[PDB]
Design a binder for these strands. Structure first.
Ligand code: NA
Ligand code: NA
Length: 327
DNA sequence: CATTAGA
DNA sequence: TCTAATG
Protein backbone atom coordinates (compact mmCIF):
# COMPACT_ATOMS: atom_id res chain seq x y z
CA UNK A 1 0.00 0.00 0.00
CA UNK A 2 3.06 2.20 0.41
CA UNK A 3 6.02 0.02 1.02
CA UNK A 4 5.82 -1.27 -2.43
CA UNK A 5 4.21 1.82 -3.99
CA UNK A 6 6.92 3.09 -6.58
CA UNK A 7 7.10 -0.41 -7.78
CA UNK A 8 3.52 -0.78 -8.29
CA UNK A 9 3.09 2.60 -9.85
CA UNK A 10 5.99 2.39 -12.17
CA UNK A 11 4.76 -1.04 -13.22
CA UNK A 12 1.17 0.08 -13.98
CA UNK A 13 2.69 2.97 -15.87
CA UNK A 14 4.57 0.28 -17.81
CA UNK A 15 1.41 -1.86 -18.25
CA UNK A 16 -0.81 1.00 -19.34
CA UNK A 17 1.67 1.98 -21.96
CA UNK A 18 1.88 -1.45 -23.76
CA UNK A 19 -1.87 -1.74 -23.70
CA UNK A 20 -2.42 1.82 -25.29
CA UNK A 21 0.43 3.08 -27.39
CA UNK A 22 1.39 -0.48 -28.29
CA UNK A 23 -0.91 -3.31 -28.78
CA UNK A 24 1.02 -5.64 -26.41
CA UNK A 25 -1.99 -7.19 -24.65
CA UNK A 26 0.27 -9.79 -23.04
CA UNK A 27 3.16 -7.50 -21.82
CA UNK A 28 0.50 -5.45 -20.60
CA UNK A 29 -1.22 -8.24 -18.86
CA UNK A 30 2.30 -9.16 -17.77
CA UNK A 31 3.03 -5.94 -15.92
CA UNK A 32 -0.34 -6.12 -14.29
CA UNK A 33 -0.23 -9.36 -12.49
CA UNK A 34 3.29 -8.48 -11.44
CA UNK A 35 2.25 -5.02 -10.32
CA UNK A 36 -0.47 -6.97 -8.50
CA UNK A 37 1.69 -9.56 -6.73
CA UNK A 38 4.37 -7.07 -5.77
CA UNK A 39 1.64 -5.03 -4.12
CA UNK A 40 0.60 -7.90 -1.87
CA UNK A 41 4.04 -8.67 -0.57
CA UNK A 42 4.53 -7.67 2.99
CA UNK A 43 8.02 -6.47 2.78
CA UNK A 44 10.19 -3.86 1.13
CA UNK A 45 11.47 -5.08 -2.20
CA UNK A 46 15.11 -4.63 -1.84
CA UNK A 47 16.14 -5.89 -5.13
CA UNK A 48 14.97 -7.42 -8.26
CA UNK A 49 16.36 -10.68 -7.26
CA UNK A 50 14.11 -10.55 -4.22
CA UNK A 51 11.21 -9.47 -6.33
CA UNK A 52 11.92 -12.11 -8.88
CA UNK A 53 11.13 -14.88 -6.43
CA UNK A 54 7.69 -13.81 -7.12
CA UNK A 55 5.00 -15.22 -9.30
CA UNK A 56 4.84 -13.42 -12.62
CA UNK A 57 8.06 -11.97 -11.83
CA UNK A 58 10.42 -12.47 -14.50
CA UNK A 59 13.81 -11.53 -15.60
CA UNK A 60 12.20 -8.74 -17.51
CA UNK A 61 10.48 -6.94 -14.69
CA UNK A 62 13.13 -7.81 -12.17
CA UNK A 63 15.53 -5.97 -14.31
CA UNK A 64 13.21 -3.02 -14.23
CA UNK A 65 12.90 -3.21 -10.42
CA UNK A 66 16.66 -2.84 -9.92
CA UNK A 67 16.96 0.18 -12.17
CA UNK A 68 14.18 1.84 -10.28
CA UNK A 69 15.57 0.83 -7.02
CA UNK A 70 19.04 1.89 -7.81
CA UNK A 71 18.24 5.28 -9.52
CA UNK A 72 15.17 7.30 -8.73
CA UNK A 73 13.72 6.51 -12.13
CA UNK A 74 13.62 4.38 -15.20
CA UNK A 75 14.66 5.39 -18.74
CA UNK A 76 11.91 3.48 -20.58
CA UNK A 77 9.63 5.22 -18.38
CA UNK A 78 11.42 8.59 -19.04
CA UNK A 79 11.51 8.00 -22.80
CA UNK A 80 7.72 7.21 -23.10
CA UNK A 81 6.73 10.13 -20.87
CA UNK A 82 8.66 12.19 -23.33
CA UNK A 83 7.42 10.54 -26.57
CA UNK A 84 5.02 12.77 -28.43
CA UNK A 85 3.28 10.06 -30.27
CA UNK A 86 2.60 8.04 -27.28
CA UNK A 87 1.73 11.29 -25.48
CA UNK A 88 -0.67 11.85 -28.19
CA UNK A 89 -2.51 8.78 -27.82
CA UNK A 90 -2.94 9.32 -24.16
CA UNK A 91 -4.59 12.58 -24.79
CA UNK A 92 -6.93 11.76 -27.65
CA UNK A 93 -8.22 8.97 -25.57
CA UNK A 94 -9.79 11.60 -23.16
CA UNK A 95 -12.28 12.22 -25.87
CA UNK A 96 -15.33 10.34 -25.13
CA UNK A 97 -15.80 7.93 -27.85
CA UNK A 98 -12.06 7.71 -28.46
CA UNK A 99 -10.43 4.55 -27.43
CA UNK A 100 -6.98 3.18 -28.03
CA UNK A 101 -7.72 1.84 -31.49
CA UNK A 102 -8.98 5.03 -32.73
CA UNK A 103 -6.42 6.99 -30.90
CA UNK A 104 -3.67 5.34 -32.81
CA UNK A 105 -5.55 5.54 -36.00
CA UNK A 106 -5.91 9.30 -35.66
CA UNK A 107 -2.42 9.73 -34.87
CA UNK A 108 -1.39 7.88 -37.77
CA UNK A 109 -3.33 10.30 -39.78
CA UNK A 110 -1.70 13.07 -37.92
CA UNK A 111 -4.64 14.23 -35.84
CA UNK A 112 -2.82 14.77 -32.58
CA UNK A 113 -4.56 17.66 -31.03
CA UNK A 114 -7.82 19.02 -29.95
CA UNK A 115 -7.78 21.32 -32.79
CA UNK A 116 -6.75 18.52 -35.19
CA UNK A 117 -9.83 16.90 -34.14
CA UNK A 118 -11.99 19.89 -34.98
CA UNK A 119 -10.54 20.42 -38.40
CA UNK A 120 -11.60 16.96 -39.14
CA UNK A 121 -14.89 16.64 -37.46
CA UNK A 122 -15.82 14.52 -40.39
CA UNK A 123 -13.38 11.79 -39.41
CA UNK A 124 -15.32 11.49 -36.20
CA UNK A 125 -18.57 9.71 -35.30
CA UNK A 126 -21.55 11.12 -33.53
CA UNK A 127 -20.43 9.72 -30.14
CA UNK A 128 -16.94 11.14 -30.69
CA UNK A 129 -18.56 14.30 -32.21
CA UNK A 130 -20.31 14.90 -29.03
CA UNK A 131 -17.35 13.98 -26.89
CA UNK A 132 -15.48 16.52 -28.81
CA UNK A 133 -18.14 18.97 -28.48
CA UNK A 134 -18.34 18.74 -24.75
CA UNK A 135 -14.71 18.00 -23.93
CA UNK A 136 -14.42 20.53 -21.08
CA UNK A 137 -17.76 19.85 -19.40
CA UNK A 138 -17.11 16.23 -19.80
CA UNK A 139 -14.09 16.27 -17.67
CA UNK A 140 -15.57 18.63 -15.02
CA UNK A 141 -16.95 17.18 -11.82
CA UNK A 142 -20.66 17.34 -10.76
CA UNK A 143 -21.38 19.14 -7.46
CA UNK A 144 -23.79 17.18 -5.39
CA UNK A 145 -25.62 20.45 -5.05
CA UNK A 146 -26.45 19.91 -8.82
CA UNK A 147 -26.86 16.14 -8.40
CA UNK A 148 -29.69 17.10 -6.15
CA UNK A 149 -31.26 19.44 -8.79
CA UNK A 150 -30.79 16.88 -11.56
CA UNK A 151 -32.15 14.03 -9.45
CA UNK A 152 -35.21 16.14 -8.60
CA UNK A 153 -36.16 16.85 -12.15
CA UNK A 154 -35.52 13.35 -13.19
CA UNK A 155 -37.75 11.85 -10.70
CA UNK A 156 -40.30 14.37 -11.78
CA UNK A 157 -40.94 13.46 -15.26
CA UNK A 158 -40.43 9.84 -14.34
CA UNK A 159 -43.40 10.22 -12.23
CA UNK A 160 -45.28 12.31 -14.77
CA UNK A 161 -45.09 9.73 -17.50
CA UNK A 162 -46.18 6.75 -15.43
CA UNK A 163 -46.62 6.72 -11.66
CA UNK A 164 -45.65 3.05 -11.66
CA UNK A 165 -41.97 3.79 -12.41
CA UNK A 166 -39.09 3.48 -9.97
CA UNK A 167 -35.83 5.22 -10.40
CA UNK A 168 -32.92 5.42 -8.23
CA UNK A 169 -29.92 7.44 -8.77
CA UNK A 170 -27.10 5.07 -7.79
CA UNK A 171 -23.32 5.73 -7.50
CA UNK A 172 -21.25 7.77 -5.11
CA UNK A 173 -24.01 10.23 -5.18
CA UNK A 174 -26.18 7.59 -3.68
CA UNK A 175 -23.30 7.06 -1.20
CA UNK A 176 -23.24 10.79 0.02
CA UNK A 177 -20.36 11.92 -2.25
CA UNK A 178 -19.58 15.69 -2.28
CA UNK A 179 -19.40 15.31 -6.07
CA UNK A 180 -19.84 12.95 -8.90
CA UNK A 181 -18.65 12.28 -12.36
CA UNK A 182 -21.88 11.50 -14.07
CA UNK A 183 -25.34 10.61 -13.16
CA UNK A 184 -26.44 7.00 -12.95
CA UNK A 185 -30.14 6.29 -13.13
CA UNK A 186 -31.38 2.69 -12.51
CA UNK A 187 -34.83 2.13 -13.81
CA UNK A 188 -37.54 -0.43 -13.50
CA UNK A 189 -41.14 -1.07 -13.75
CA UNK A 190 -43.47 -3.83 -12.43
CA UNK A 191 -44.66 -4.47 -15.92
CA UNK A 192 -41.04 -5.57 -16.66
CA UNK A 193 -39.18 -8.43 -15.12
CA UNK A 194 -37.01 -11.40 -15.99
CA UNK A 195 -39.51 -13.14 -18.40
CA UNK A 196 -42.19 -10.55 -19.31
CA UNK A 197 -40.94 -10.06 -22.84
CA UNK A 198 -39.75 -6.48 -22.58
CA UNK A 199 -41.45 -3.21 -23.22
CA UNK A 200 -38.71 -1.20 -24.96
CA UNK A 201 -41.09 1.63 -24.88
CA UNK A 202 -40.80 1.56 -21.07
CA UNK A 203 -37.34 2.95 -21.58
CA UNK A 204 -38.22 5.03 -24.51
CA UNK A 205 -41.13 6.81 -22.91
CA UNK A 206 -38.99 8.51 -20.32
CA UNK A 207 -36.08 9.38 -22.53
CA UNK A 208 -38.53 11.17 -24.58
CA UNK A 209 -40.00 12.71 -21.52
CA UNK A 210 -36.69 14.12 -20.46
CA UNK A 211 -36.04 15.45 -23.90
CA UNK A 212 -39.33 17.06 -24.24
CA UNK A 213 -38.51 19.21 -21.41
CA UNK A 214 -34.93 19.85 -22.20
CA UNK A 215 -33.13 17.84 -19.68
CA UNK A 216 -31.70 15.51 -22.38
CA UNK A 217 -29.81 17.27 -25.01
CA UNK A 218 -28.09 14.60 -26.93
CA UNK A 219 -27.99 10.99 -27.55
CA UNK A 220 -24.73 9.03 -27.23
CA UNK A 221 -26.63 5.89 -27.46
CA UNK A 222 -30.07 4.60 -27.21
CA UNK A 223 -30.98 0.98 -26.95
CA UNK A 224 -33.99 -0.80 -25.66
CA UNK A 225 -32.54 -1.16 -22.24
CA UNK A 226 -29.80 1.27 -21.83
CA UNK A 227 -29.78 4.84 -22.89
CA UNK A 228 -26.52 6.81 -22.66
CA UNK A 229 -26.60 10.55 -23.11
CA UNK A 230 -25.85 14.21 -22.21
CA UNK A 231 -27.96 16.63 -20.05
CA UNK A 232 -28.08 20.12 -18.65
CA UNK A 233 -29.83 22.07 -15.95
CA UNK A 234 -31.90 24.95 -17.12
CA UNK A 235 -29.67 27.87 -17.21
CA UNK A 236 -31.46 30.10 -14.83
CA UNK A 237 -32.28 33.75 -15.10
CA UNK A 238 -29.11 34.24 -17.06
CA UNK A 239 -25.46 35.03 -16.51
CA UNK A 240 -24.93 31.39 -15.58
CA UNK A 241 -25.57 28.41 -17.81
CA UNK A 242 -24.85 24.84 -16.80
CA UNK A 243 -22.13 22.55 -18.16
CA UNK A 244 -23.05 19.50 -20.24
CA UNK A 245 -23.32 16.35 -18.17
CA UNK A 246 -23.09 12.72 -19.06
CA UNK A 247 -26.08 10.77 -18.03
CA UNK A 248 -27.12 7.09 -18.23
CA UNK A 249 -30.61 5.62 -17.71
CA UNK A 250 -31.12 1.80 -17.80
CA UNK A 251 -34.11 -0.49 -17.85
CA UNK A 252 -34.45 -3.34 -15.41
CA UNK A 253 -36.79 -6.17 -14.61
CA UNK A 254 -38.55 -5.12 -11.36
CA UNK A 255 -37.50 -8.57 -10.15
CA UNK A 256 -33.86 -7.55 -10.36
CA UNK A 257 -33.71 -3.99 -9.07
CA UNK A 258 -32.43 -4.11 -5.44
CA UNK A 259 -29.48 -6.37 -6.22
CA UNK A 260 -28.65 -4.13 -9.11
CA UNK A 261 -29.39 -1.10 -7.02
CA UNK A 262 -27.29 -2.37 -4.17
CA UNK A 263 -24.56 -3.24 -6.43
CA UNK A 264 -24.17 -0.11 -8.61
CA UNK A 265 -24.32 1.90 -5.36
CA UNK A 266 -21.04 0.09 -4.27
CA UNK A 267 -18.59 1.01 -3.01
CA UNK A 268 -16.46 -1.39 -4.97
CA UNK A 269 -15.16 -2.67 -1.63
CA UNK A 270 -18.49 -2.53 0.24
CA UNK A 271 -19.73 -4.82 -2.37
CA UNK A 272 -16.78 -7.15 -2.54
CA UNK A 273 -16.92 -7.36 1.18
CA UNK A 274 -20.63 -7.87 1.49
CA UNK A 275 -20.35 -10.37 -1.26
CA UNK A 276 -17.52 -12.24 0.45
CA UNK A 277 -19.78 -12.62 3.46
CA UNK A 278 -22.86 -13.87 1.59
CA UNK A 279 -20.49 -16.86 0.72
CA UNK A 280 -20.05 -17.80 4.30
CA UNK A 281 -23.66 -17.04 5.01
CA UNK A 282 -24.37 -19.75 2.36
CA UNK A 283 -25.10 -17.42 -0.52
CA UNK A 284 -24.16 -15.85 -3.79
CA UNK A 285 -24.57 -12.26 -4.79
CA UNK A 286 -24.15 -10.78 -8.22
CA UNK A 287 -25.43 -7.77 -10.14
CA UNK A 288 -28.85 -9.40 -10.55
CA UNK A 289 -29.68 -11.68 -7.84
CA UNK A 290 -28.87 -13.78 -4.73
CA UNK A 291 -28.71 -17.48 -4.81
CA UNK A 292 -28.49 -20.01 -1.99
CA UNK A 293 -25.38 -22.13 -2.03
CA UNK A 294 -25.58 -25.91 -2.32
CA UNK A 295 -22.83 -27.97 -0.74
CA UNK A 296 -22.16 -30.05 -4.01
CA UNK A 297 -19.93 -27.14 -4.84
CA UNK A 298 -22.48 -24.72 -6.19
CA UNK A 299 -26.15 -24.18 -6.49
CA UNK A 300 -28.94 -21.98 -7.99
CA UNK A 301 -32.39 -20.64 -7.19
CA UNK A 302 -32.87 -16.83 -6.95
CA UNK A 303 -34.26 -15.73 -3.68
CA UNK A 304 -36.94 -13.09 -3.74
CA UNK A 305 -36.03 -9.41 -3.22
CA UNK A 306 -38.38 -6.40 -2.58
CA UNK A 307 -35.78 -4.21 -0.88
CA UNK A 308 -32.09 -3.52 -0.16
CA UNK A 309 -33.00 -4.98 3.24
CA UNK A 310 -34.08 -8.44 1.90
CA UNK A 311 -30.64 -8.99 0.56
CA UNK A 312 -29.32 -7.81 4.02
CA UNK A 313 -31.62 -10.04 6.07
CA UNK A 314 -30.74 -12.88 3.83
CA UNK A 315 -27.03 -12.74 4.73
CA UNK A 316 -28.01 -11.74 8.19
CA UNK A 317 -26.18 -8.48 8.34
CA UNK A 318 -26.65 -5.03 9.51
CA UNK A 319 -28.63 -2.79 7.20
CA UNK A 320 -26.07 -0.37 6.02
CA UNK A 321 -27.34 3.07 5.06
CA UNK A 322 -25.94 3.83 1.70
CA UNK A 323 -24.14 6.74 3.45
CA UNK A 324 -21.83 4.25 5.16
CA UNK A 325 -21.58 1.67 2.35
CA UNK A 326 -18.16 3.08 1.94
CA UNK A 327 -16.49 -0.24 2.69
C1' DC B 1 -19.26 -8.33 -18.91
C1' DA B 2 -23.00 -6.66 -21.35
C1' DT B 3 -24.89 -3.39 -24.40
C1' DT B 4 -24.61 -0.30 -28.50
C1' DA B 5 -22.58 1.50 -33.03
C1' DG B 6 -20.92 0.78 -37.03
C1' DA B 7 -19.02 -0.56 -41.11
C1' DT C 1 -20.47 -10.34 -38.40
C1' DC C 2 -17.00 -8.50 -35.84
C1' DT C 3 -14.81 -5.00 -33.38
C1' DA C 4 -14.59 -1.01 -30.64
C1' DA C 5 -16.07 1.86 -26.77
C1' DT C 6 -18.76 2.73 -22.11
C1' DG C 7 -19.52 1.40 -17.78
NA1 NA D 1 9.06 -16.45 -10.25
NA1 NA E 1 -11.98 8.09 -24.29
Amino acid sequence: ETLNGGITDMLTELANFEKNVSQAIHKYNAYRKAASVIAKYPHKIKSGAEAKKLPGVGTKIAEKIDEFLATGKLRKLEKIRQDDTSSSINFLTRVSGIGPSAARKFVDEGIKTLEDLRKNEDKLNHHQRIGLKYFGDFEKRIPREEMLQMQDIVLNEVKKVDSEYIATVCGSFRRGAESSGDMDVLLTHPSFTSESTKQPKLLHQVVEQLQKVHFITDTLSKGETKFMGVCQLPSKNDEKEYPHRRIDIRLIPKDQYYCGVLYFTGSDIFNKNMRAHALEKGFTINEYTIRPLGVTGVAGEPLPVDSEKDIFDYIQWKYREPKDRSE
